[PDB]
Amino acid sequence: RTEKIICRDVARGYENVPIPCVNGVDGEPCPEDYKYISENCETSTMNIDRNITHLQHCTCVDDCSSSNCLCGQLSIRCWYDKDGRLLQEPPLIFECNQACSCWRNCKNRVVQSGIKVRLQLYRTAKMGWGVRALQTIPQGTFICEYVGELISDAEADVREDDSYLFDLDNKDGEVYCIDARYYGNISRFINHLCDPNIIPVRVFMLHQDLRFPRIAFFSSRDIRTGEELGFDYGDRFWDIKSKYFTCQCGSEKCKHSAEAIALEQS
Amino acid sequence: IRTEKIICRDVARGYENVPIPCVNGVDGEPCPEDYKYISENCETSTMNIDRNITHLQHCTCVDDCSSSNCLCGQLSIRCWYDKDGRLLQEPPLIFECNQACSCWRNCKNRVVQSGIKVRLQLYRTAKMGWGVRALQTIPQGTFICEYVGELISDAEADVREDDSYLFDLDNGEVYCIDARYYGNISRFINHLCDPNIIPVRVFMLHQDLRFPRIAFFSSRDIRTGEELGFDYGDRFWDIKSKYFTCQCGSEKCKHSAEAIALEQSRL
Ligand SMILES: CCCC[C@H](NC(=O)c1[nH]c2c(c1C)C(=O)CC(C)(C)C2)C(=O)Nc1ccc(OC2CCN(C)CC2)cc1
Ligand SMILES: CCCC[C@H](NC(=O)c1[nH]c2c(c1C)C(=O)CC(C)(C)C2)C(=O)Nc1ccc(OC2CCN(C)CC2)cc1
Ligand SMILES: Nc1ncnc2c1ncn2[C@@H]1O[C@H](C[C@@H](N)CC[C@H](N)C(=O)O)[C@@H](O)[C@H]1O
Ligand SMILES: Nc1ncnc2c1ncn2[C@@H]1O[C@H](C[C@@H](N)CC[C@H](N)C(=O)O)[C@@H](O)[C@H]1O
Ligand SMILES: [Zn+2]
Ligand SMILES: [Zn+2]
Ligand SMILES: [Zn+2]
Ligand SMILES: [Zn+2]
Ligand SMILES: [Zn+2]
Ligand SMILES: [Zn+2]
Ligand SMILES: [Zn+2]
Ligand SMILES: [Zn+2]
């Protein structure tokens, strides 16, 4: 069967680079049961706090490469190197923002600068659609953001389709989620892998509304061209979904196959 | 004879598509720093802007939105963009395409949201403080820049001391953009009685009608070196003419000491 190109860019020019879609496995058409958005949306009143006078910010007159940068100090157990790659309680990134004295091209601006690597939406053998790299990707490289519809945890609890639901797990305050079922970007198609090669990290950029950390994926290891991207959806997801389907990642250390679940239960 | 110094390579600190340098060949005034440069409007208290994506009117085009079937183009009042992104013209109202539209990010109805494309310079004028001039030919109808600042209420505008950077959106609920403390290059654009740019109300990523954004388009071909200016309006000058008179130098200046003398003479 020929690998068919069925969309030049599922993001319709909204990302820095196109994200084409191909299918060399079956007759499934380009997915159109959702609306592609490049940034989070709301379908009820969220009213993100964007008061510029309440942003924590730095006073750097360099490129924010020094340890004296306040924004770097606010970041929890992680930092960017000279090439914009991430090094590591879960981590938390505070990027520079419109209140900082620094320039838009300072060293603390990786996620807000968007997608740089070539990605492809493709039909997998056993998991539906998936996302793969069309280039080599060094460890620590920003891949993409988990984008979708901002909703409350109360709303998330009553929605029937949770296959694209991301829980932000807020520490202090009410808990919010990003639901990518009806509105989402390329990340909604990233599958679960028990041997993951990307990791999600909470990030603040142009607002510091603690209800709404944004979710950035970074590679956790060097990734080779053609490799499927995947992250660990987490035990909570699988405790819920396993009664409907089990993991087909096929790793030797798969944790969520029928067999693995059986072994955990014994 | 004083010669011109470059005193900042980019007052926007890399936030615009192009750098906006500042020069002074007139006096010893340093790069202005009694404000915070911002490339997009800010809030210091919430305006509760409606950003519900389901409230957006949007089009179904999969072309470049150049057809008359584009709903967004239909919603635009008494104006439209040509194939080069130039504006042609009860003031006009622009509805650009948005994230709910089915079209691509590079369609023909995205001029203002795509940002500054012309080359501008902040410079020291002889009599009007800082001003902004063209560094290139700017054809008639070309987008120049947005009037960016702090979104504030009518009431808040009333209690603020300095209104030299205050723009009334001319609305329902009444709001202003105050560029005194937070603003972009537009805060430095002076009044001209022979204006060469015009402010136009625009909607882009929201359609909260209380909060049009303000886009300047050239009203004629502008040549390199020409100072940019719009008509601030009679309201501004009714207030300000007591404190200073217009220095624009136009043969038909409406607000000079000379013009004021005549008006006070007639009445
Ligand atoms: C599709 C995205 C990947 C799975 C998702 N993972 C995460 O939310 C998550 N959150 C963090 C991570 C991850 C992976 C992290 O890694 C760290 C973090 C701090 C970013 C926090 C998840 O757990 N989703 C989910 C699905 C269903 C649920 O059931 C609820 C609501 C639906 N019905 C009604 C039953 C009740 C609950 C949750
Ligand atoms: C500096 C910017 C240029 C002057 C400014 N012009 C406009 O607002 C304006 N609005 C439109 C235009 C223009 C030029 C248009 O051309 C068309 C439009 C639809 C965009 C609507 C203006 O009129 N400002 C202003 C200043 C003082 C005022 O008095 C208030 C607040 C101060 N004290 C408290 C007294 C009360 C009021 C307003
Ligand atoms: N490791 C996995 N094993 C089996 N199914 C998976 C796995 N990871 C993801 N899936 C499937 O993909 C859904 C999660 C989606 N966010 C991923 C995109 C999905 N593959 C699609 O085609 O739309 C899950 O509900 C499963 O249907
Ligand atoms: N035509 C004019 N004649 C005299 N002064 C002007 C004129 N236009 C603008 N100004 C001055 O500029 C102020 C308006 C500002 N938005 C423009 C930038 C200002 N020139 C500055 O240096 O900051 C007015 O309050 C005046 O001080
Ligand atoms: Zn810094
Ligand atoms: Zn910085
Ligand atoms: Zn900073
Ligand atoms: Zn597995
Ligand atoms: Zn259209
Ligand atoms: Zn369009
Ligand atoms: Zn449209
Ligand atoms: Zn004049």
Helix (H, G, I), strand (E, B), or coil: what is residue A231?
A: strand
DSSP string for residues in A207-223? ---TT--EEEEEESS-B
Name chain A contacts of B38, Cβ cutoff 8 Å.
52, 98
Distance CA B195, CA A180 (A): 48
H or E stretch covering A100: none
Query: What letter would DSSP give residue B62?
Result: S
What whole-number distance in Å separates Cα of residue A219 and Cα of residue B150? Answer: 38
CA distance A196 to A230: 5
* Burial of residue B31, with CB atoms counted within 10 A of its CB: 0-12 exposed, 13-18 middle, 19 or more buried: middle
Which among A58, A97, A49, A212 is positioned nearest to B44, based on CA atoms? A49
B130 Cβ closer than 6 Å to some ligand 4 atom: yes
Looking up tokens 């202003």 gives: B176
Task: Show the CA angle centred on residue B140, arms to residues B134 and B141, nearest 5°.
Answer: 105
Q: Sign of the CA dihedral A104, A107, A113, A116?
A: positive
Q: Which amino acid is at A129?
A: W
Question: How many distinct helices (H) and strands (E) make up chain B?
Answer: 4, 16
The CB density around residue B62, as the number of other CB atoms within 10 Å, is 12
The number of domains in chain B is 1
Name the residue among A111, A139, A120, A137 with its Cα closest to residue A213.
Answer: A111
Cα distances from B110 to residues A113, A171, B92, B213, in angstroms, run 20, 39, 16, 14
Ligand lying closest to the C-alpha of residue B128: 4
Q: Is A18 left (phi over 0), alpha (psi -120 to 50) or beta?
A: beta
Strands A230-231 and B5-8: unpaired
Single out the residue of B43, B83, B55, B40 nearest to residue B184, CA to CA: B40
CB contact at 8 A, A96 and A185 = no
CA angle A3, A5, A10 (to 5 degrees): 135
Ligand 2: residues with CB < 6 A are: B 91, 157-158, 163, 165-168, 170, 199, 201, 214, 232-233, 235-236, 239
Q: What is the DSSP string of B112-146?
A: GGG---S-EEEEE-SSSSEEEEESS-B-TT-EEEE
Q: Are A153 and A179 in contact (CB under 8 A)?
A: no
Neighboring chain A residues of B40 at a CB cutoff of 8 Å: 98
For residue A128, the CA-to-ligand 3 centroid distance in Å is 6
Helix (H, G, I), strand (E, B), or coil: what is residue A238?
A: helix
Q: CA-to-CA distance for A187 and A24, rounded, in angstroms? A: 20
Q: Which two tokens stand for residue B166?
A: 């205050």
Residue B145, φ and ψ in degrees, nearest 5: -170, 165
Pairing of strands A176-184, A86-87: unpaired
Mark the binding-site residues of B, compressed into ranges.
Answer: 59, 61, 65, 70, 72, 97, 101, 103, 107, 128-130, 165, 190-191, 193, 246-248, 253
User: What is the separation, in whole angstroms, between the first and last Cα of chain A?
Assistant: 43
Which helix (H) or strand (E) segment holds residue B240: the answer is helix B234-240
Nearest-neighbour CA in chain A from B204: distance (Å): 14
Contact A230, A143 (CB under 8 A): no
- The CB of B187 under 6 Å from ligand 4? The reply is yes
Say how far apart CA B37 and CA B11 lie, in whole Å. 7
Output the DSSP codes for B206-217: ---TT--EEEEE
Give the helix ranges, DSSP H, for chain A: 70-74, 153-158, 235-241, 258-264
Residues 6+ away with beta carbon under 8 Å from A264: none
Residues B22 and B13: beta-carbon distance below 8 Å: no
Structural domain boundaries, residue B232:
2-267
Interior angle at CA A227, CA A78 and CA A76, nearest 5:
10
- The alpha carbon of A121 and the centre of ligand 3 are apart by a number of angstroms equal to 13
**Interchain CB distance below 8 Å, A37 and B99:** yes
| A237 Cβ contact partners less than 8 Å away, ≥ 6 residues apart | A192
| Contact (CB, 8 A) for A204 and A266 | no
| C-alpha span between A79 and A96 (Å, rounded) | 12
Q: Please name every residue paired with B116 in a beta bridge, in sequence order, or none if there are none.
A: none
CATH number, domain of A191, equals 2.170.270.10
Method of elucidation: X-ray
